[PDB]
């Protein structure tokens, strides 16, 4: 444990520990900073460049840094509502919104920051902001099925070799971790289609309900036949084993 450092965010003094990001300091100090790519469960990447803040150092001018990753090791003053910060956020928001105009998250952010879609600067709007959230979620889960497959403006998150992924599991965490809702995970009856691959779902024998696929349960290595029961059915079946004695 190192000595905590005292820093000032928008005129608010606070002692934060060593090796703590600016975003964490703002979160514990009640300050709100917009983020798109950062996920607290995934190894940070700093892609979207939307959580820009001004870092003012003793004798040094304010510079833009990403709050989601910039650590607090010295005495600095952070400004989140500066004109330069607002201009940078407007620029990044314009780019992201032109990339994904139908997104609710980006439209909400634009309404917050007064940004409108431009028809001249909308090249290939495909509802993907390349935040890499899905790739990192897949990597942390254990199956590294999906991954980026190009560089530049043509960058895309695809299954390997542009075919139904051979290492996908069907959990659907990549679709859950997606700001723009570009990934779709549709379930019809006992079928789950994600990344244009069909996964068979599991139905509990006394309920007909579904919460996971066969591939996911095989991946987790849970050989208990109760794992195929839905949580309510499994809970009821276990609770039936308790012979309550009314006398």
């Amino acid at each position: 444990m190192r000595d905590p450092i005292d820093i000032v965010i928008d005129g608010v003094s606070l002692s934060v520990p060593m090796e703590t990001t600016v975003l964490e300091a703002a979160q514990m100090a009640g300050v709100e900073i917009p983020t798109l790519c950062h996920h607290p469960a995934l190894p940070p990447d700093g892609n979207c460049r939307l959580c820009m803040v001004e870092i003012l150092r003793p004798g040094r001018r304010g510079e833009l840094a990403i709050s989601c990753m910039y650590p607090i090791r010295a005495q600095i003053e952070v400004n989140t509502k500066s004109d330069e910060v607002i201009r940078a956020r407007k620029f990044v928001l314009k780019l992201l919104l032109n990339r994904a105009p139908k997104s609710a998250r980006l439209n909400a952010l634009a309404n917050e920051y007064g940004v409108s879609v431009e028809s001249r600067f909308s090249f290939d709007p495909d509802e993907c902001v390349r935040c890499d959230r899905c790739v990192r979620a897949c990597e942390t889960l254990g199956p590294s099925a999906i991954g980026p497959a190009w560089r530049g403006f043509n960058k895309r998150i695809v299954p390997p070799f542009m075919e139904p992924p051979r290492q996908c599991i069907g959990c659907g965490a990549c679709a859950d971790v997606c700001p723009t809702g570009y990934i779709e995970c549709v379930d019809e009856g006992d079928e789950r289609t994600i990344w244009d691959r069909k996964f068979t779902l599991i139905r509990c024998p006394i309920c007909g309900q579904t919460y996971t696929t066969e591939e996911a349960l095989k991946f987790t290595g849970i050989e208990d036949p109760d794992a195929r029961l839905c949580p309510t059915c499994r809970k009821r079946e276990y609770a039936s084993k308790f012979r309550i004695f009314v006398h």
Binding site: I206, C207, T232, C233, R236, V246
Partner: protein
């Protein structure tokens, strides 16, 4: 929204059309819910002169604003239709866990109109509502129907179903929820059967939003303290159910015996709640969000079912003279399975016994010995009436029509063609006035005058007095109407006044609710029901009691030598109600209550 869900499910059984419509929130303000709002919808839609078994009649499952919430004993709902037994408006309250599940699926009401060509049942899973063929379950009892429908729809769903008695159009059939909870009186189950509706199966996964959670929690803690401290709702009901009243009522000499011929039953000790708790009570069971556990789980004659409640015990006990607690429990189980009225069944059995005493009924025609106290007779006749086998064909018409068939309608202890419960009007004047003035028949929990007269819950009253009785009866009826509409245990009136209920309701629905507002709403509901009944043909001259309770004094017991003075209390009740000497609501009273449009519609 807050308290209510705002959605009404309308199911047309004739055309297989299911539609969603918003709940009328102005009617919700004037008529809180459950009985009140269901009555308002029935008045708006159902013509009061319709035949109860006609497709034009409607069956409404209505929940209250607080139903499904953590509020004390807020798990209740009503079934509203036109009663086939009485011809009045029939508002049937059941609790259990069906009303909360209906509100968890996102509905405040279900309306059933028309008649399905084939036996069908309604399956509700949140917003997914569909009618399904019920030919396989048609004919099974409540337990088998519930098991099959749960096995084919959802294990966690709740089933409100009729038994064979409802399918055979027994005039005192019932709707059974949770296999033991019954919304049973003045038909209701017969109406459901006449529409070829076997059951309603609902599975709710949504929530009920409150306005202020913290204020509701504070009021709930206060109410829970008051309930737990109270002797009845704290120690009495959880330990002896509602059957605790057997010794209390009999000690006052107000327990009708041998078809209201006597008011004191010497076999009371064998059938009392204490004896049942000692001998056959397996456990106690609580309705949705109920601090008390008035439900009995008993095992009698090798079978296990929800134990007989006080009125059932009297109807198969003191009413028939049977002191066999196990036989009473078995008859209650048979009623639960077949979907019948233990009060009406027991009163009709007692009327048949008294007719056999006069020799009008042959023991070979009945198929069993109709002597007082025959424990076999109650079970045999209950099964026969449930399946309409031989003599059951006559017992399935109720005690009033059974007496009419033999030329002795005066032997039927019923007001407005609905048999009276276990409280002798000759010993309790307030109960006599309540039986006369109840808006659906001989019901006693429309206004429970027994509470202050015997239990002395609001104030210990003299059962012989007839002076303060009209005002107490009116207050109890209006308070009961409001409590029914809200969706609370009416047993909460033993521990809580309208202040606690309002303090719970106001942070739920989101508006300032006071006791005076609830009383006014209850009076409005009661007058709406009276307008419906008057249009339907129930003349004010039927606000009377059988001549046995008016001219024959009690022969023996602690209440020996007492008659009912209804002729002296009824005019005062009419004056206090704002109604004329002819019992019809006046224009000024309707203007005060806001019921002018209804009265103009009915042209009374």
């Amino acid at each position: 929204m807050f308290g209510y869900m705002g959605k009404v499910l309308r199911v047309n059984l004739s055309t297989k059309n299911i539609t969603l419509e918003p709940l009328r929130m102005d009617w919700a303000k004037d008529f809180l819910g459950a009985r009140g709002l269901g009555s308002r919808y029935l008045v708006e839609e159902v013509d009061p002169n319709v035949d109860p078994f006609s497709p034009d009649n409607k069956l409404i499952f209505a929940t209250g604003p607080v139903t499904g919430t953590l509020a004390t004993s807020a798990g209740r709902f009503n079934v509203v239709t036109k009663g086939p037994l009485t011809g009045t408006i029939a508002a049937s309250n059941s609790g259990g866990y069906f009303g909360p599940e209906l509100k968890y699926a996102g509905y405040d009401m279900i309306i059933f109109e028309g008649k399905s060509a084939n036996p069908v049942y309604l399956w509700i899973y949140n917003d997914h509502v569909e009618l399904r063929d019920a030919s396989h379950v048609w004919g099974k009892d409540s337990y088998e129907t519930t098991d099959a429908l749960l096995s084919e729809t959802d294990p966690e769903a709740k089933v409100a179903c009729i038994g064979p008695a409802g399918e055979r159009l027994v005039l005192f059939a019932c709707v059974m929820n949770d296999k033991h909870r019954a919304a049973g009186r003045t038909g209701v189950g017969a109406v459901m059967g006449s529409k070829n509706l076997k059951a309603v199966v609902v599975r709710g996964t949504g929530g009920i939003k409150l306005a202020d959670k913290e204020a509701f929690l504070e009021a709930l803690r206060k109410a829970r303290k008051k309930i737990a401290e109270h002797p009845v709702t704290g120690g009495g009901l959880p330990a002896y159910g509602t059957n605790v009243l057997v010794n209390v009522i009999n000690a006052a000499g107000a327990l009708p015996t041998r078809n209201f011929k006597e008011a004191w039953f010497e076999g009371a000790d064998k059938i009392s709640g204490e004896t049942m708790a000692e001998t056959i009570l397996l456990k106690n069971k609580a309705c949705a969000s109920c601090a008390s556990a008035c439900g009995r789980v008993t095992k009698a004659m090798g079978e296990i079912g929800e134990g007989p409640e006080y009125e059932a015990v009297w109807a198969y006990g003191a009413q028939c003279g049977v002191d066999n607690l196990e036989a009473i429990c078995k008859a209650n189980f048979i009623c639960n399975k077949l979907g019948m009225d233990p009060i009406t069944m027991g009163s009709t059995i007692g009327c048949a016994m008294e007719l056999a005493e006069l020799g009008l009924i042959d023991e070979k025609k009945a198929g069993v010995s109709l002597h007082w106290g025959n424990a076999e007779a109650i079970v045999k006749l209950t099964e026969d009436t449930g399946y309409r086998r031989g003599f059951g064909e006559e017992l399935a018409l109720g005690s009033y029509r059974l007496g009419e068939k033999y030329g002795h309608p005066e032997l039927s202890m019923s007001a407005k063609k609905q048999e009276m419960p276990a409280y002798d009007p000759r010993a309790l004047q307030g109960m006599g006035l309540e039986y006369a003035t109840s808006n659906r028949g001989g019901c006693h929990v429309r206004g429970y005058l027994t509470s202050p007269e015997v239990l002395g819950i609001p104030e210990k009253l003299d059962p012989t007095d007839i002076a303060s009785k009209p005002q107490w009866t009116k207050t109890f009826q209006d308070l009961t109407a409001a409590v029914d509409s809200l969706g609370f245990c009416l047993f909460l009136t033993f521990a809580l006044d309208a202040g606690d209920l309002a303090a719970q309701v106001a942070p739920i629905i989101g508006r300032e609710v006071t006791a005076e507002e609830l009383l006014l709403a209850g009076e409005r509901i009661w007058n709406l029901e009276r307008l419906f009944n008057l249009k339907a043909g129930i003349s004010p001259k039927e606000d009377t009691l059988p001549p046995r309770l008016l001219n024959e004094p009690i022969p023996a017991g602690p209440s020996k030598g007492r008659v009912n003075k209804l002729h002296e209390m009824l005019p005062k009740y009419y004056e206090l109600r704002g109604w004329g000497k002819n019992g019809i609501p006046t224009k000024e009273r309707l203007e005060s209550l806001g019921l002018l449009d209804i009265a103009a519609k009915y042209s009374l």
